[PDB]
């Protein structure tokens, strides 16, 4: 199962920014213009529309991937082994892997 990593967005007030490509799995980046975000302390930006938020996201392996994962294998002819238990005459049972 995958995890999506989402870094802190870049909020540019009274200006604009641009997205760049990055070497991340399923990396996404987009700049949304005309934002007027608010924080606990009030309006974050001064300009009413000349502000942009650049969002980023990419896919990661989740923490569970270390224990909960499926392994895909190519299977070829290998070997055949057996455990054989043998007794004869007055000799008691003896066994070995063959």
């Amino acid at each position: 199962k995958y995890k999506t990593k989402v870094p802190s967005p870049v909020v540019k007030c009274c200006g604009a920014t641009q997205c760049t490509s990055k070497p991340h799995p399923d990396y996404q980046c987009q700049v949304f213009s005309g934002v007027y975000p608010f924080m606990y302390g009030g309006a974050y930006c001064f300009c009413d529309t000349e502000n942009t938020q650049m969002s980023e996201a990419y896919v990661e392996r989740s923490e569970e991937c270390s224990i909960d994962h499926a392994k895909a294998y190519k299977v070829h002819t290998g070997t055949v082994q057996a455990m054989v238990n043998i007794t004869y005459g007055s000799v008691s049972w003896r066994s070995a892997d063959v």
Partner: protein, 98 residues
């Protein structure tokens, strides 16, 4: 493919080169809110775990028992086994002595 078994693939569980195929798409943030919304196809590994079906452990013919360490099929009752055993010469008693 996204939402299917192989949407996320890694050559090994500790590699640093990950393949991911999900429709991860960044969505516009809600008005006045600083966050990074997105949509994505639900994990195909979780989907597969729901739709796995019967494992080989439950459908193998000839009564095979499937074990993993190492991967093997045990006690498959197929065919016959030629054998050759060299019995110690001390295990034999002469006819006139019996």
């Amino acid at each position: 493919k996204a939402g299917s078994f192989g949407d996320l693939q890694s050559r090994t569980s500790t590699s640093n080169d990950l393949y991911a195929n999900t429709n991860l798409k960044l969505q516009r943030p809600q008005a006045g809110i600083v966050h990074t919304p997105f949509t994505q196809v639900p994990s195909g590994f979780e989907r597969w775990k729901k739709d796995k079906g019967a494992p080989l452990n439950d459908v193998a013919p000839f009564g095979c028992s499937i074990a993993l360490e190492p991967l093997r099929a045990e006690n498959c009752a197929v065919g016959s086994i030629p054998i050759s055993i060299d019995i110690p010469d001390a295990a034999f008693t002469r006819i006139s002595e019996t």
